[model samples]
Target: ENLYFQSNAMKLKNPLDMHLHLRDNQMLELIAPLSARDFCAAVIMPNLIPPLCNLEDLKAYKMRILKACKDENFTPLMTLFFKNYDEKFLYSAKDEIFGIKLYPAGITTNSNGGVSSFDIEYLKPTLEAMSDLNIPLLVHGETNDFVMDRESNFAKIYEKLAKHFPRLKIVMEHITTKTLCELLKDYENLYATITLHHLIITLDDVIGGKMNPHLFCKPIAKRYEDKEALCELAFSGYEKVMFGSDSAPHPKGCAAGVFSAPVILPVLAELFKQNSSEENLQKFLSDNTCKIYDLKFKEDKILTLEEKEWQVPNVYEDKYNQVVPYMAGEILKFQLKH
Candidate 1:
């Protein structure tokens, strides 16, 4: 039963953040609730300090996330770091887990233990198991080599995996290249998650002007051409191209995350309104990811935004925490109404 709400205020179903990192301890307390409130749930990343591999670690992490969110409506679609083949654990805990997240070794934060050498032979057994069980594999989509060409260069590997496991669902996380746009359309099992920052920011935004360590992120923003390509896909209503904030936060210095959970909807709404239609906006923001992942959304969980201008807070918090958001201090065209 889908319920619709409309007025001067823009109405839409509750959205989900498919790729999110709610770090542990004080940062978790500060960031978890913001995501919990703004989105229905997130595909929780497992790159914690030690990382969550076994059942005990994953179980404990889920409990902490639940305690932090404290909302029955909010859920965490948890994932494990793909270190090695854990067929027994995955098969037994399929009900509790969404899928596995793959990050190449030395790629990003806490990813040292990640898959070092994307050895197909070594990874075959696990991939075969996931293919059989219908488990989805989410990848960071980069190599340890060049900074800008990493994503484009990594495309062949993705193609190989897709061809091998026809049944396996593979997601290219926070994809930042035009190459992926073509690959996404070409492959049957391949899908991609575009972060809000990737659609809006370019490499210039990170370094064109003054150095903004905050706007920086892994698989870092690409060229203007790349950004335009991503924008086109987001507004094109491609079901394979979906929303995931990749809303990662670091305790200041070398941390590259734009905290847009507070204002991402209106920002997206305005972009879609300019580039596409209201109907298209709804799909890009909420519906597309939901369908691709087979996620259950609260039809009744609709968000109403009134016609008004709201300024994104400059910083998430001052005294206790310091996590900067994209376009902080910028005025947005709409506001969320409870």
Candidate 2:
């Protein structure tokens, strides 16, 4: 324990990102490699321009991702955008698909096919199939009714789903509020993933200075109290909470999305290195995520980080996009140990 306390470097094995957005085509090519290289495995979100609807699309997308990542050891935990889907299709596709993603209509990018209503009677078949087959439900738990209150507004939906499917495993993806953490404890089957940016920034960081478009993301940052709660939750030693970067990328001079993949581990290392023990930090970053998803993690995929200084790049440029990262101009203490 003293070694962990004094050591400037920390090595973690097979860190899994539970929630990530790797868009299709050139974007996928550019970002998937970073994710595949950085994390042992990641759960791929299905909120494509045209949401990943059917099994054929899911299979094809998986092939495309496999080609892009080109890491035989890497696992792409793929998901489907929820719709009025068929039981037969879901049952057949359960082996390949990791879970079903539910988005409230018009909430975020490429969520056109998202559920217009949370009425379980309408989504009964799909939810029922997932519960019956033991497939997880990953939710973007926010309503389009308000900007800041979106996530809080959707709290009832979580309770509704939890109450309805007592056997189902539910993941509240990139949860922004601390209140939700307490809400999660009431339901044994419920769990949540917190993003790096959400743990760091708040509404003040976004607009209190100069309107940082780069830091802008749906279920946008909350108050300082909310940010504090998130940080505490990460180190809370709570088994149900884990990490997901929500690394979304968009072409410059357009709508907003923060590319956080480049510094995910470094940011996490800095945060956890300060607030948590190695064992607790390890569970938040890698162990808890894999256990919930029932994944076969790699013991050898280890990474070491040192308490060194490095500046985040202003813009991340590939052939197709010039995207800005979350902490573009700031220097941080954690650096990858090559």
Candidate 3:
């Protein structure tokens, strides 16, 4: 332990921004410590093995998640993101459901039929139903209709929907454009979750003669200016624009598959500390979330963040976990401590 540690670790009690990857067995293993790290809760994606869309599915899934978080030390507050859901079954599962996640079918990983032939209006009834019961919907936000024109599709949805569903709350997950931040600026009910890669890299990291499939994600990172705009959005004193680390987990053997990995969590503090401001860092980490979730976390959790250049571990606890390290890879340190 470093004797120089002075900041209060009360921030650890605050809900950590998380994008959980409970896709398979190996991924499930990352849940516990992943939550304990800096995140205290999560908005679970319903892109599971069979997917959770209704009461029976939720009941079974809840039982297993409850089992996973049975050790009360780390509170695993699960939000149920939806798949193909209708009013009756949806309402039945409403009580335990977290905000619903809408993927405009076939746009991203594991999302085949998230929402079908959907204009945002196509799902208005379902959104209305959830809002009737006070359940907010977290939108995937990007339109997937044209494979060749994803960014334009994203703007069409993000720009027009503000007036359409003005009342319900939303988080435009994993944004990679400033166009999004423009829309988000005026919509009080709208909040956007920024991922590490979106903040860390750009199109150069992807299609510009260097495509690392693992780095490939929906609404892929844009130009350097677009990236800077996002950083500005984070620093703009807007609490709604907090963090959502989509720490997706995948086993080493299955690594050759399509979906991204759960590398977000361990390197996040470093990402934010280095990329954002000290004050915005605290708001993103400490304050902004309460505006969205109504849940209480450790307001006293004040941990120190350093600004020195460093590298992240190649694979965190790799040998012990029997998996490819999400937190593994390279030098430097942004150690978060009590």
What is the C-alpha lDDT profile of model 2 across 1-338, one tens digit per residue? Answer: 55545447688888888889889898888778877877888899999878888888989999999999985457888999988776898889899888889888878888877789878798888888888999999999998776888888888899999999888999999999866877888899899999988988999888999988888887799998888888887886577888888899876644757789888988888787688777777888888876777667435588888888889888877878766776778897888864
Model 1: runs farther than 4 Å from truth? 1-7, 297-299, 318-320
| Residue-level lDDT tens digits of model 3 in 19-110 | 55555343454554545444556666777755665657756765666565555444444455465456786677666776777777666666
| Cα-based lDDT at residue 87, candidate 2 | 81
User: For each candidate, what TM-score against the reference?
Assistant: 0.93, 0.94, 0.80
lDDT for model 1 comes to 0.82
Per-residue lDDT over 114-224 for candidate 1, one digit per residue giving the tens place of the 0 to 100 score: 887777888888988888888889998898678999999999999999998888999999989999988998789999888888888898878999988878888888888
Error of 1 at 298 (Å): 5.9
TM-score winner: 2
Top candidate on lDDT is 2
Better of 2 and 3 by TM-score: 2
- Name the better of 1 and 3 by TM-score: 1
Backbone clash pairs in model 2 (N, Cα, C under 3 Å; residues 3+ apart or in different chains), count: 0
Tell me which of candidates 1 and 2 scores higher on TM-score: 2
Model 3 spans with C-alpha error above 4 angstroms: 1-13, 69-72, 79-90, 119-121, 145-149, 253-268, 271-275, 297-313, 316-327
